[PDB]
């Protein structure tokens, strides 16, 4: 149960982001949808709000410091605190190595691992004031544990989002903040849904050959992992990973 | 929820067992606890059945082939099925390894690993009927992962643990059958009071020293996970070990 | 270079295991083979004889207590010490957890987890003894990192083999001892060889395609790990000046499982 | 047996990419000193030369796209070919989270994920040409593995590394092109040794407190893990990491 507490997840307009944002809402989280697509976060805010919900739309390039800043004060001031905040926002650019563009590479770096720094610098200035204190969630991937090839720069993302939050689990203790990492498999999307027919079989070899049962994982998997985390009673789980990929990846 | 789910955990006279049982009944969950003391495993089901829930006990010695399939079958015929297998019975015996004496190697390595081969290999005949499934769940430790002196034979059992673990995901997933790891950091158990004698001091330094924040996992932490994974909705976290450390060994 | 130095082998009669005792020996080692197979072993002893090296064969059940101390007294008597033991005597056994026997589940762990116990208490009496010191490895395999279906028991002694190594580096470091488990992927051994054609008919594919689909397909090159791969590994291990690499695990498996 | 073989080291003016660069020089190989230190890069390089090696200094900014290919290209033509590629130079910058500023965020990461990136790239180039070959080598840390407070951009970055080693380890293998990032411990410097004085019970617990025996990794430790990887006979060992850090941390 989350009842008056208040979270922030970036992305939310959107596929996991977005049933995150519904279930902790769900919980009775007062939620702010943080994206790029603003439109897409007022929709999502205003499906939450017309439930009997709270939740409000905050426009967010969580690459750009200032509007990072701007938007968490925003759900402060909204709502009186930062509890909650999943950093989820991301895309995929893929390319071997050798024609990686430069470019391509530092936006990736930017979006999934500058964006869960700078968003995590400013809930903090929130979470650490009178230790009240918080639970910080960053979205990895089977890929922080695991590469494939022709996405160098989205494992070296995923896999740098544990470091930063194993020093966060550290940092944050004496404050009273928890950090983990949700690393989900491959989730069935719209667009999953289009290379099926296309890539042909396709499902249970090619896409989930890595999967123990060829199950895809869901947003509903992932979504129920981060309220576990969210609602934990104590910090006995700070500065873990947790793979829900259907038994790609074993730790 | 667990209603209409039975289970059988093993060591559940005392401490984590003990707790796990309990949290597990109030869900709603047939519990059966089995333990080498069938007088406590009698006891706790006494306390479950008292406060309207469902439980028995069952004399069983992990080490023993014939009584772990003689209670695991008593569970069934009792129940009507065996839908969660906690493995869990354990003891500590330290020493360095020039005088480790190799019948206390074997005894370790036989109620640790044994035992959880055993009580696995007889719930799946019961989990496999129809591919009605389950859920196994192996009581691990931090030292499931990391290592400390004078404890070669328990680190040596709890890292075998996850090989076994992570081979029945693979296995059980055609019929519906999940596996984890529980790994908890200290908890104020018998086990853990026995062991300090021969090492405030060796608590708050040589233990918890290890944690990011100085607090002991507790009874509850343990079994609060321990549920979650018993009540996931598909086979999304099939495989994986949990660390419910206080941030010691950090995955 | 290891002159000067002894190390015992165990299961060396064949494969892995043998190949690493020549390399020992050709680096300068002194290597007592241990292995159930007396005239195998003797065979490898007598081989690093004749090319000028120095060894002797240990009859030596590794699953049994007696038999693993008087042998390493053996060897510490015969060569004045034993400063490396690489504990590498296996077996497979392959069933479903629900149909696995409980003989054979014990027997596995014997050769496997007691072996390496047993071998390690016996060879540390003497790497203990004025702090000489000394180098053990234990012979996991990338299932001591990973699970394949059918082979609970292999995989779960294979991983324990690496908390066994964990504390050894934490207790052996007073005493200048250091620890570490070598991980190959697979390597075509007799057991191996005789797999291949067997999966091969059972799966219904073909010989090529069991290899580089079935047993390969977690590498990132379809190439078999090599005994030449495992013994440089364990060579380099052996000699190393310092105890910096103690209690890690070295994955040789062309990139099936990466740590 | 490095004879004939081409070596680019970065940050080799100094420290462990310095003791790197001399012992493959040592080995048989020739060896471009890059670093931003172009004074020290040559000094390297003289001191190679004047011993009986091949070495040329290379000014080159890694963070720096066009600097590194001109550089990478500069050895490909004085040389031959690029055979060995180690990815080294590195700083450090302390600051808890909430106060670390995103210049030194970008700045490190720049420096250790752009840097090993972009020479990878380059180096790629040359090695994948009638795929004849080579060895990436990044220096990460045991903080790759394991986080420590004040280090969110350090860890977050050598973490980061393991990422993008898996990857090419999977990409370049059909061009004979191996990866592996080498771990070490704390390696003691002139710093440490002003510092031991500041604080042999420094040494043994703030220190090396976390090691099995109290003992610093040396750069001659490194630099033969280094030797060994680059003349391994096979691809046996791609993708892997090496932790030379006396014990802290296992894996
Ligand atoms: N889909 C999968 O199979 C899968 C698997 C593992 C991990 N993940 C991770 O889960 C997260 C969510 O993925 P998804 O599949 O739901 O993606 P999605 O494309 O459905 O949603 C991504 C959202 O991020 C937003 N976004 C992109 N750049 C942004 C920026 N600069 N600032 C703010 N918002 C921005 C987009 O507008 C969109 O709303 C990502 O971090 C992804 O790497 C996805
Ligand atoms: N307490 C901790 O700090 C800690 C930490 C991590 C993991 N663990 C693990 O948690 C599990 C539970 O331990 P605990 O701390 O609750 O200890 P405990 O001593 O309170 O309970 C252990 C139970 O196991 C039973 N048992 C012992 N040998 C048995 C056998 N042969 N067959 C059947 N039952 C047997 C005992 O009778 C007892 O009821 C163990 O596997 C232990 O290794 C404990
Ligand atoms: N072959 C592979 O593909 C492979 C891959 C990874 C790891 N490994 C491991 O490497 C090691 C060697 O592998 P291998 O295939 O060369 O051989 P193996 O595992 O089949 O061992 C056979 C050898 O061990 C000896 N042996 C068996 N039981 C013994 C006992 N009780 N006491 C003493 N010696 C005994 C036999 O006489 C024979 O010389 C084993 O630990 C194995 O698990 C093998
Ligand atoms: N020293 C340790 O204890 C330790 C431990 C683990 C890992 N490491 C890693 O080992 C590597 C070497 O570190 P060190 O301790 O030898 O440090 P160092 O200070 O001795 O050497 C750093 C070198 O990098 C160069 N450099 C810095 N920025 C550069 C840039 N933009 N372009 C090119 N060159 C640049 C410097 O000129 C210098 O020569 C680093 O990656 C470091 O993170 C060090």
Request: with cysteine; hydrophobic share 45%; net charge neutral.
């Amino acid at each position: 149960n989350l009842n008056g507490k208040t979270a922030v997840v970036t992305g939310a307009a959107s596929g996991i982001g977005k049933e995150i944002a519904l279930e902790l809402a769900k919980a009775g989280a007062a939620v702010a949808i943080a994206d790029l697509n603003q439109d897409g976060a007022n929709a999502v805010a205003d499906e939450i709000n017309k439930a009997g919900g709270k939740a409000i739309g905050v426009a967010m390039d969580v690459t750009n410091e200032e509007a990072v800043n701007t938007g968490i004060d925003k759900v402060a001031e909204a709502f009186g605190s930062v509890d909650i905040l999943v950093s989820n926002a991301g895309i995929q650019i893929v390319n071997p190595i050798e024609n990686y563009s430069f470019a391509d590479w530092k936006k990736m770096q930017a979006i999934h691992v500058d964006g869960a720094f700078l968003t995590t610098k400013a809930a903090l200035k929130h979470m650490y004031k009178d230790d009240r204190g918080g639970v910080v969630i960053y979205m990895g991937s089977v890929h922080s544990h695991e590469a494939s090839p022709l996405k160098s720069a989205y494992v070296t993302a995923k896999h740098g989002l544990l470091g930063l939050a194993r020093v966060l689990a550290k940092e944050g203790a004496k404050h009273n903040v928890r950090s983990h990492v949700v690393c989900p498999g491959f989730v069935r999307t719209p667009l999953v849904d289009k290379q099926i027919p296309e890539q042909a079989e396709v499902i249970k070899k090619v896409m989930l050959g890595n999967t123990v049962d060829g199950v895809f994982t869901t947003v509903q998997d992932v979504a129920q992992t981060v309220l576990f985390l969210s609602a934990f009673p104590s910090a006995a789980l700070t500065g873990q990973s947790f793979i829900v990929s259907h038994g790609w990846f074993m730790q």
